[model samples]
Target: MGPGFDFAQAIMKKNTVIARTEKGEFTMLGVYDRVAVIPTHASVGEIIYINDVETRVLDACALRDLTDTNLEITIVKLDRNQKFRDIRHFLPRCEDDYNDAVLSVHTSKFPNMYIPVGQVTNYGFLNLGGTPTHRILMYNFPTRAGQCGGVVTTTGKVIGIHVGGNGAQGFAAMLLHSYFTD
Candidate 1:
């Protein structure tokens, strides 16, 4: 047919108790009681610790990619996720200017000063196969490997989750508010 299907898509991602940040942790967005959304990556085995608690990843290379408005969201399970229950979502529908100001916050937790943006558009991502479609892009903002799953904020609102990018451009995906929505 197409790509060979995997029957064990629900296989749980590994969990560990060791706290290792020298390797950088992928920031996570909690979607439910013990689950969250994360950026797609090859290093899912990395241990996630928050306040020194074990937060395990449950999904790895299983879910289908988001179409049209793509933003590269990978789902996960947060076993010891008590620390991330307060974060939420944001959008730019009513803003006077779409490419205004922004700040990227990730597992690094601080030094998150606001970064000026050049534009916000539905730029297509070409790496996800098929046709280029939709995703949010932030010009002038930088992206890091560890910050790929972090949040993009303005003043006090969650604009989106950082997906990936280079020194001055970053892509973001699914706002926290609709991680569970259809």
Candidate 2:
């Protein structure tokens, strides 16, 4: 060993890689349509970890700022040139959207764990950023404190992004039809 710190060896031996921003590390929920959907707290032009690799953030936007809802979901785009296929077909129909079952991914704690959506609770204003805001509660799901930017899917299709919730009940930003193409 010539030197005490071996940067290359540390990177190669590490099993877990976390996202890094100016504030600190955060989770990258998942990528959709070539863009990454992260938590609202992440600012634009921040650097996040993608598979132990450093990736530059091109842009980020919060749902509360875009629409009337206070659901804290932020969509991010990377500076990389890779393209990921869209999962629009995974969205549920409007008529039975509420009753439809869904799944949320907790990338931070359990990277492969996809918690099943047990109950789709009624819509209401929940506490977000210390303020009550319009949201739909998803029940019977387990999540960590900072697992807000996870992806929610139903029947192998993506429906929304997990915003917030307690250990048993969580909330998600349901995908609207107007946001997709024909």
Candidate 3:
């Protein structure tokens, strides 16, 4: 739930990993407190590498999808868990406009600049399945569906996981602690 803060050894940068599932490849959020967290859309036995450490899906849970919002989150275990220790963790929160300096990384291995959190509320009604619940909108952050599981955070605290996005606006599932605990 929380992580040690050394400012030197932090999981904030290594938090975003990629999931190569049978369905396709997608980004995933690596929570240092536990294991990595991926979208339920990932097929069973998906593969992901955290900072070059390979891992496999050990357990997954697809929550009751009462709406269009994503409800699945999978936990992955490292192939050799003994090699790493003292990873930083980012706790999820509900507040917005915390800072305009948020950041995330994508599959391209390129650094994703942060856009203000305020822009997220504008596209709040675009999804057809249901209005995106607890979503954070990004402005000018071009992204695709493949990067849905990426992490977004500011000041070392997680705000959400990238759910989906268009060329300009991107969506993320905010306040992920509930799913993390589930």
Best by lDDT: 2
Residue range 12-63, candidate 2, lDDT tens digits: 1231134556644454533345565555655546666666578877777666
Query: In candidate 3, what are the lDDT values of residues 1-182, reduced to their tens digit?
Result: 12213221244444555556656556566555445666555654644554445566455554433564544445565453543232334565444544443434455444343333434342333352353343444545666555566665555666666666667666665544554553
Please give each candidate's TM-score: 0.57, 0.68, 0.61
Q: Flag regions of model 3 displaced more than 4 Å.
A: 1-14, 44-55, 64-69, 72-89, 95-98, 101-103, 106-140
The backbone clash count of each candidate, in order, is 3, 1, 2
Estimate the overall C-alpha local distance difference test score of candidate 1.
0.46
User: What local distance difference test score does each model get?
Assistant: 0.46, 0.53, 0.50
Q: Residue by residue across 1-182, what tens digits does model 1's lDDT show?
A: 11111101111112111222344565554544555565554245545665466556554432344553544666555556353343433334422324443534433453232344445664544443342424454545665455555555444344555666756677665353545543
Q: List the residue pairs that clash in candidate 2.
A: 90-157
Clashing pairs in 3: 120-137, 148-162
